[model samples]
Target chain A: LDFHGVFPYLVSPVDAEGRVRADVMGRLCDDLIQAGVHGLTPLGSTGEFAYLGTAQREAVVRATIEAAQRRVPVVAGVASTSVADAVAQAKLYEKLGADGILAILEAYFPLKDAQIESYFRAIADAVEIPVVIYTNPQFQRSDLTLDVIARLAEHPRIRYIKDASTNTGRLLSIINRCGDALQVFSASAHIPAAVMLIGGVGWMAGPACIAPRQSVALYELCKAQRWDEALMLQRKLWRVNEAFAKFNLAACIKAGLALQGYDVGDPIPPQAALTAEERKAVEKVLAEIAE
Target chain B: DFHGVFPYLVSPVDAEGRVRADVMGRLCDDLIQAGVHGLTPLGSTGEFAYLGTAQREAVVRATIEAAQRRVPVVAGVASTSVADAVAQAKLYEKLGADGILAILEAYFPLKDAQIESYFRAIADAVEIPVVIYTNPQFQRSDLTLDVIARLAEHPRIRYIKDASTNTGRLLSIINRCGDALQVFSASAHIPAAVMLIGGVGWMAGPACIAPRQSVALYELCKAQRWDEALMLQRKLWRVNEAFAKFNLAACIKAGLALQGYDVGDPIPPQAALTAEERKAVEKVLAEIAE
Candidate 1:
C-alpha cells in the first residue's frame, strides 16, 4: 500500500468498433509495470473515462487487474456525479481487484464545499481501500479547497491527493497544511520535477504512458536528491509535456503511443484525434524522449 | 413539435432512492393545469445530474403517464458518453417523450467538434425533436455560435435552450441560426428580453413555481402586448433573482416544499437550502402571490 514514484496513467486503447481494446490495454499495463512503474492507474484522464460507458469502464479495470496480476497496484479512477453511482463504481472496482480508487467528482451542478468534500468521502467510505482525491479545477465545477483537503485528510481512508491545478505553490501549501496526513501526486498539468521538489510523492499523468522509462528515471533522480540530473532529464521529458500542452491531452498521448508502435489509436470523439500534421508534430517529440 | 412555457419539472426522490411517482404525477398535472405548454422532466431544475438511471426513468414515466397526451413531455437526456446519452434518448422516446432536451456533460474539457457531435448523435437516434440545452455555468463546454448553426441544419435538431447569463448571446444565436434554430431562454437569463428578441418562450425553474405567471407572460408576448408582458415579466423576475441566490435544484425544491408539493431538496451530496434561505424564497413567493 506504499504508493510513491512514477505511476503512468494508462490509456484505454479502444478500437474503431466502439469496443475497448482489452488486449492493447493489457499489453500496455504489463509493459509499464515491467518498466518499473510503481503502480498502474487505469481510468485516469488518459483512460478517457468520460467517453466510456459503464460496461466499458468495467472491462478496462478488469483488463488492467488481469494484466497486472498483482505485479503492481492498479489505482483506477472512479468519477460520477451521483454519490450512489460513484460509490457503486468504487466498490465494483475494488471487488474486481482494484487496489485503490482515484475519486473524481464529475459535477454538472455547482456544489457547495461540503457537498464537494462529501463526494470523495463517500467514495472512500464505500470500499476498504486507500482513496486518492483527484481534483482538477480546470474541468471540475466545484474544487476541493485547502480547508476541504485538510478536513478530508482526517479521514482514515483518504490518504492521498492529486492536484492538477498546475500551481506548484498550491502543492507546497497542501504539503504544509496536511503534512503526513496526505500524500500528493502532481497531475499531467503539473511539472513532476517541480512537484517532487515541493514534496509530491510521485506523479500520475498520460505523458508517462509513452515515456515510462524516462519518467521513472526522472523520478529516481528526484528521489536520490540529484536535483541537477533530475532537472536535465525533466527538461528532455518535457518535450512530451510541451506537445501535450499544444493539443488535447488524450489526443496527444494517444498519437504518441501510436507512433511508438503501440497502436493506441485516436482519442474518443467528439474529442478530435491529432490530425496527420499534428501526429507528425508528436512523432518528432516521442523520438527525442523515448529511450 | 414544441414551444413555450415548459416548466423544468422538479423530481421528488425519497431518501431511499425511489422516485416519488405520486408527487411527480401531481406536479405534471398541476403544471399542465396551470396552462404551461409542456413538461420537461430532468432539466437542471429537476436535479438530473444527481438522479440514477432508474430514478430518471421513473420520473420520465410518471411525467408521460401524467401528461395523458394532453401536453408534450420533453425529457432531459444528458450524459458524458455518447452511447449512454443515445441509449437514454431512445428509451425516453420509446417511453413516449415528445422531444428530447439533450444536455452535453463533459468530465474533461471537450473540443467544439466533440461537443457538437455529442448532441448530434442523440438527435439522430430519436425520431422526435431535440431541444439542445446549454448552460455555460454548469457545462464544461458550451456550443459556440458556429456549432449551434451547424447543428441547426440537422433536421431534428430544431430548438435551443440557452442558460448563459448573457442575454445578448441569445440574440446572436437567433440572428445566426435564423429559423433553423428556435431559441428558449433559461431562468438564468432575462426571459422577457429573450421573448422580445423573438425567442419562442422559456424553459426554466422559475416556471415550476409560477407556471401561471410564466404562461401569462408568454401569452402577453404572443399577443404582442409588449407593455403588458414587460409588466408581468418585471413582477415575475423577482422569483428568479431569489432562486439564483441558492443552488438551482435546492431553491426550486424549497419553493415547491413551501407550496405543499413535498418535492425533496436537491439530491445529495448537493446541499439543501438552509432555513434562512428557504424563508427568503418564501418571501419572494409571497410577494409574487400578492
Candidate 2:
C-alpha cells in the first residue's frame, strides 16, 4: 500500500455505555473520505487505544474498514506492551482488511534498544501488510533511536514512520538515513507544510479529523510545490493545533468533532473531557478555520 | 480481607515467552508452606507491565490454584484506562481471586479525579475486596492523600499497599483513613516501622525468597516485640538493599533461581541480574538466613 497523504486519526466514537458506536465511527469515516482525506487511521493517540479493550479496538477497526470500502487506505494502529498482544492485534487488523498497520509500543518499564527494535520487527514479521512504526518520546516510556530506526527500515515490510518527536531535524535525519526504505508522516507536533518541505510524504494527525478539506488542500498545495500558498494555509490550520494544545490531546480533538456536528463523544474516561469554556474556545477556532 | 506477608510472585516465563505455570504454581505452594500470609501476582516484582493478557491470566490462575483456599490471592489489576482495569478485576474475581490490587498505569499525567475514578471503577466492578496500590517511584500517576481518603470511603475499597518510600505519608494515610482503610507496607519502607504505625503487614517481592524470615518479623511486630522486630528488620534490610542495587524483579528472580525455582529472567526489555549481582543476592540470602 502506497500510504502517502493526509490520513486523519479518527476518534473512537464510543457511547456512554462503553460500546464502540459503530454507526458514529462509520459516518465519520465516510465524511472524512468524502472530504478528500487520502486515508483513515483509527486507534492512534486520539483514539485512546490505551483506554480501549480488545473488543472496542476490534469494533473501531472493523467500522473503519467497512466504511472505507477500499476507496482509501485504512491504516489501523496496533499498540500494546506485550509483543504477543501486539502481534495478535496486528494480525487481526490485517485479517479485517486494513491496508497497513501503524505499530506502536506502549511500555511501562523502560526498555533496552534491542528490545524496542525487536517489538517492531516482531509485528512486521507477523503481518504481511506494510508496517508504519510510530514513535513519540514525549509519552512513551521507551522510544526508538536513529540506529534502531535505521535497522528497522531494512526490513522489507517496515516501510514508513510516523514520528511525533516534535523535532523537524529528526525527520530529515530519518529521511537521510533510511532513504526511500521509510517514508515520513508528520504528527501534530510538526508544522505539516514544513515537514513536507523537508521530504515528509504527508501527515497523520487528529487535528485533521476536524479540518479534513483544509488539510487535504494544504497537502495538494505542497505536492504541487506551492510553498507560499501551503504555508499560508498551514498557518491558519495551525490554529486548530494551537487550540488543541490548550486542552487534553484527545479531548480537544473530540470537542472539535462534536462542534462540527459529529457525536464523537468525550475522550475516554480517566482522560477528562473539555470543559464548556474550553469547548467554546475550540468552537471559535473551528469556526475561524471554516472547513 | 488483607494482611500479613504476601510475596508478590514473579510470572515465570520461558524461552518461548510462555508463562511457566508449573514453575509459578510450585513457587506459590512453597511460599505458602514457608508461611507467607498470601500471594500477589503481577506486582512490580511480578513484571505486570511487561506481560500480555494471557501471561497475566496464567500468573493469576496458577496462584489461585496453588493457593487452594489455604490463603487469599490478591491479583494485581493495572491499566491506563478504567474499562480495561475493570475488566481485569472482573476476570480475576471470576478466576477466584480473594481481592484485587488495583494499580493505575498512565501514559499521560492524570489529575486526582482521573486517578480516583480508575480505582473506584475497579472496586465497583467486582464483589471481591480491592486494595489500591501506589508506588510513586515507578507509576506515572501517584495517588494523592485526598483521593485515597475519598476512595477509602467505598465499602469494597478495603486496603492500600503504598510504596511511596515515605513512611510519614503512610502514617498520614493511616491517620486520614482510620479503620475505614487498612495499610500494607511496601518493601521499600522499613516494614517494622510501618507495622509500628498501624500497618497490617507488607506485600513485597523479598518475601518470595525470605518468606520464613518475613513471617517471623510479621509475628514479632504483631506481638509488639519492637526490639526483636527491629533486630530482624535490620538484617532483612540487607535483602532489600541488595535487590535495590539491581532491578527488583531481576534481583528477586536471581534469589529464587539460587533457591532452585525455575523462574526465568525478568521478561525481556528487562534484563536479569548479572553473575556478580547474583552472587551479591546469594550473599544477602546467606547473611539473612535464620
Candidate 3:
C-alpha cells in the first residue's frame, strides 16, 4: 500500500502497422526500473489506450508486468468507453500479476458524480488489487474534484490518485481533505516537488518516460526532505517538460525517447509526428538537460 | 451526381427520453417535399455519432424510410474507432441508406495514408456513395487538402462536406480538385458564399427547422439570382448564429417546438436551454420565419 515515490507511465511503442512492439515495450519497462522509478504504469494515456484494441491492451499490460519483475509496483491503465469493458480490463490486469490498476473515468456522457462514484465502486469490488484513480480533466470531461476524491477514498480498493487536474489549489485541498486516507501523486513534473514538500506521496509523470534518472533524483530529494535541492531539480526538469507541451504531446514524448536510442517511433496517424521545427526545439532542450 | 443543396439533419426527441418518431417523420417529409436537394441525417447537427448504436440505427432508419426516395439520405457513419465506423457504415447500407458521411474520431493517432485506407475500405465494402465529413476542429486533428485530394480518387468517394470552419481551404478544394471532388458548404454561415464560388451544394443545419426559406434561398442561387438569395441566406444564417450562441442541438430542438412540432428536448450532456437562451431562440425563429 506504500507508493511514496515516483511512478512513471511507460509508453507502449508500436510498429508501423499499429501492432504493439512487445520486445521494445518490454525493454522500456526494464529501462525505467533500472533508472530507479518507484513504480511503472503501462497503458496509460501515454500508452494511447484509446487507440489499442482490447487484445492488444492485454499484451502491453502483461509484458510490462513481466519486465518489471517485482522490481517496482506495476500499475496498468484501464480505460474504455464502456464501463463493463473497463471493469473486465481491471480484472484482467489483476490476474496478469499487475500490482495495481490506474482507472480513468472516461466516456460517460454528461457523467454524473454519483454515476462516476458507482462506476469506480464496481471496479473496486471486482478486483482485489489496489486501484489508483487517474484524473486528467483536459481530455476526459469528468473532473474529479477534491470532494469527489474524498468520497472515492472511502472505497476499500481506492488507495491512490494520479492527480493531473492541473489545479494546484485542488491538489492541496485533496491532500488536506484525505491526508493519510489516500495517496495523492502529482501529475505535472513541475508540481511534484512542491506537492511532495506539502506531504504528497509522490508523482506520476510522462516526462520520466524519457528522463528517468532526473525524475528518480527529484523524487529522492523530495523524499529525503531536501526541499531546496528538489526544487532545483524540478526547475531543470521543467525546461524539457515545458517544451514538450508546445507541440504534439505524444509525438514529442516518443521523439524524445527515440533521441535517447529507445525504439519508440512516430505517434499513430491523425497525430502527426513532431514537425522538423518541433524536433529541433525538443533536441535543444533535451541536450540542455543532458549537459 | 447532383448534390444541389444538402442540409445537416437534427435528431428529434421528446420529454419521455424516446425518439419522437412522428415529429421526425414530418420534419424529413417537409424538407424533402420543400425542394431541398438532399437531406443529411445524423451529422454533428443531428448529434448522430454521440448517440448509442441502437439509437443511431433507429434514427437513420426513421429518416431514410420517411424520406422514401424523395431525396438521397446520407446517414452519419462516425465513430472514435475505424472498426466501429465500418460496422455502422454496413448497418446504414443494410438499412437502405443512399450514402454515408464519415467523421474522424479522436480515439487514435492516424496517418493520412491510414485515414485514406480507412475510407477506401468502407467505400469498397459498400455499393452506395460515400462523402467524407472533414471537421478537424472537432476531431482534434487536421485532414490536409492533399489527403482529401488523394481520397477523392476513390470511385465511391463522391463528395466532401467541408466543415473545417476554414473558408480558405474550401476555396482551395474548389480550385485544385473541383473536377473530381464535389464540395458542399457545411454551415449556414457560408452557404451563399460557398455556393457562389463554384461550389456544388450546401448542407444547411438551420434549414431543418425552416425548410421553405432555406430551399428557396438555394433555388434563387441556382437560378442565378444573387441579391435576393443573399438576403434569404442572411436571414437563415442569423437563425443559425443565434442558435449557435447557445447549445445548438438544444436550440434546434427548441426551434422545432416553436414551429409546433413537439420533437422533445435534446438528450443529457446536451441539456435543455436556459430560460434566457430559450427566449433568444424563440425571438430569432419568429423574426426569421415571419
Candidate 4:
C-alpha cells in the first residue's frame, strides 16, 4: 500500500463505563477521510492504546476499518512489553484486515539494542502487511537506536517509521543511514514542511485529528514543491501544536474535537481533562486557524 | 499470605525461553520445607517485568502446586491496563493463589485516580485477598498515602508491601490505616525495624536465598525478642546490602544458582550478575549460614 500523507491519530472516545465509543469514533474516522486524510491510524498515542483493554482496543481498530471502508489504508498500532503479546496484537490486526501495522514498544525495564531490535523484528515477522515502526524516546522506556533501526529496516515488512523525537537532524540521519531501505514519516512534534523538504513521505500526528483539511492541504503544498505556501500554512498550524504542548497531548486533541462537535470524551483517568481556561485557549487557536 | 516471611520466587526459564516448571516447583518445595511462611511467585525477583504471559502462568501454577496448601502462595499480578491486571488476578485465583500481589506497570505517568483504579479494579475482579505492591524506585507510578488509604478501605485490599526504602513512610502507612491495612516490608528496608514498627512481616527477594534465617528473624521479632532479633537482623542485612549494590533479580538468581537451583540467569535485556558480584553474594550467604 502507498503509506504516505496526513494520517490523523484517532482518539479513543471511551465513555464512563470503559466501552469504546464506536459511533463517535466511526463518525470521526468518516469525517477525517472525507476531509482528505490519506490514511487512518487507530490506537495511536492519541487513542490512549496504553489505557485501553483488549476489547476496547479491538473495538477501536474494528470501528476504524469499518468506517474507512477501504477509502484509506488503516495502520493499526500494536504495542506490548512482551514479544508474545506484541506478536499476538500484530497477528490479530492482520487477521482483522488492517492495511498495515504500526508497531510501538511499551517498556518497564531498560533494554539493550539487541532486545529492542528483536521486538520490532518479531512484529514484522508475525504479519503479512507492512509495518511502520514508531519511536518516541520521550515516552518509551527503551528506545530504538540508529543501529537497531538500520537492522529492523532489513525486514521486508518493516518499511516505514514515525519518529516523535522532535529532532530534524535525527530524521535526516535516519534517511541518510537507511537510504532506500526504510522510509521516514514526520511526527507533529517536528515541522512537517521542514521534514518534507528533507525527505519525509508525510506526517502522522494527533494535531491532524482536528485540522485534517489544512493538514492535507499542507501535504499537497509540500508535494507540489510550493515551500513558501506550505510554510505559511505550517506556521499557522504550529499554533495548534503549540497549544497542545501546553497540556496533555490526548487531552488537547480531545478538547479540540469536543469544540468541533465530535463529542470525544476526556482522556482516560490518571490523565486529567483540559480545564475550562485551557479549553478556551485551544478554542481560540483553532478559531484563528479557521479564520 | 498477609503476614510472615514470603520469598518472591524467581521465574526460572531455560535457554530456549521456556519456563522450567520442574525447577520452579522444586525450589518452591524446598523453600516450604525450609520453613518459609509463604511463596510469592512473579515478585521483582521473579522478574515479572521480563516475563511473558505463558511464562508467568507456568511460574504461578508451579508455586501453587508445590505448596499443596501447606502454605499460602500469593502470586504477583502486574499489568499496564486494568483488564489485563484483572484477568491475571482472576486466573491466579482460579489457579489456587491464596492472595494477589497487585503491581501497577505504567509506561506513561498516571494520576492518583488512575493508579487507584488499577489496584481497585484488580481487587474487584478476585475473590481472594489483595496485597498491593509498591516500589517507587522501579515502578513508574507509585501509591501515595491518600491512594493507599483509599485502597485500604476495600474489603479485599488487606495488605501492602512498601519498597520506597524510607522507614518513615512505613510509619505513616501504619498510622494512617491502622488495622484496615497491614504492612509488609520490602527487601530495601530492614525487616526487623519494620516488624518493630508494627509491620506484620516481609515479602522480599532476599528471603528466597535465606529462608531459614528470614523465618528465624521473623519468629524472633514476633516473640518480642528484641535483642536476638536485632542480632539476626544485622547479619541478614548483608544479603540486602549485596542486593542493593547489584541488580535485584540478578543477585537473587545468582544466590539461588549458588545454592544449585539451576534457576538460569535473569531474563535477557536484564543481564546476570557478574562473577565478582556472585561471589560477593556467596560470601554474604555463607556468613549468614554460619
Candidates' C-alpha lDDT: 0.86, 0.89, 0.76, 0.87
Q: What is the full ranking by DockQ, best candidate first? A: 1, 2, 4, 3
Candidate 3 per-residue lDDT, tens place, A1-291, comes to 487687876777877666778788888888888888899988876677766667778988988888888888998888754455577789999999988888876642355576567677778888998888878676666667667778999988899888775666666777788877888887763377778777788887778887888888888888898888988888888877778776656677888888888887777554567777778888888888883
DockQ, candidate 1, vs. native dimer: 0.57
lDDT of 4 by residue, B41-93 (tens): 99877888767667788889988998899999999998877767887899999
Candidate 2 lDDT tens digits, B153-231: 8999989999878899989988998989999988889999999899999999899989999999999999999999989
lDDT of 1 by residue, B38-122 (tens): 8899998888877877889999999999999999999999887787898899999999999999988775577787788899999
Off by over 4 Å in 4: A13-24, A154-157, A258-285, B12-23, B50-62, B82-96, B120-129, B149-158, B175-180, B196-198, B220-247, B250-290
* TM-score ranking of the models: 1, 2, 4, 3
Global fold similarity of model 4 (TM-score): 0.84
Per-residue alpha-carbon lDDT of model 3 for B1-290, expressed as tens digits? 75676667778855444576777798888778878788888887787634656778888889888898888898888765555677789999999999988776675456676677677777876889898888666565447889888888888888888775677778888787877888887763377787787777877677777777877777788788999998887787777777656656667777777778777766543456777778888888789764
Name the candidate, 2 or 4, with the larger TM-score value.
2
The docking quality of candidate 3, as DockQ, is 0.15
DockQ (0 to 1) for model 4: 0.33
Better of 3 and 4 by TM-score: 4
How far in Å is the alpha carbon of B182 misplaced in model 3?
1.0
Ranking by lDDT, best first? 2, 4, 1, 3
> Of 1 and 2, which scores higher on DockQ?
1
Give the better candidate number (2 or 3) by lDDT.
2
**Each prediction's DockQ?**
0.57, 0.52, 0.15, 0.33
Give the clashing residue pairs of candidate 3, or none.
A268-B109, A269-B109, A269-B110, A269-B111, A270-B110, B6-B203, B7-B204, B13-B264, B14-B264
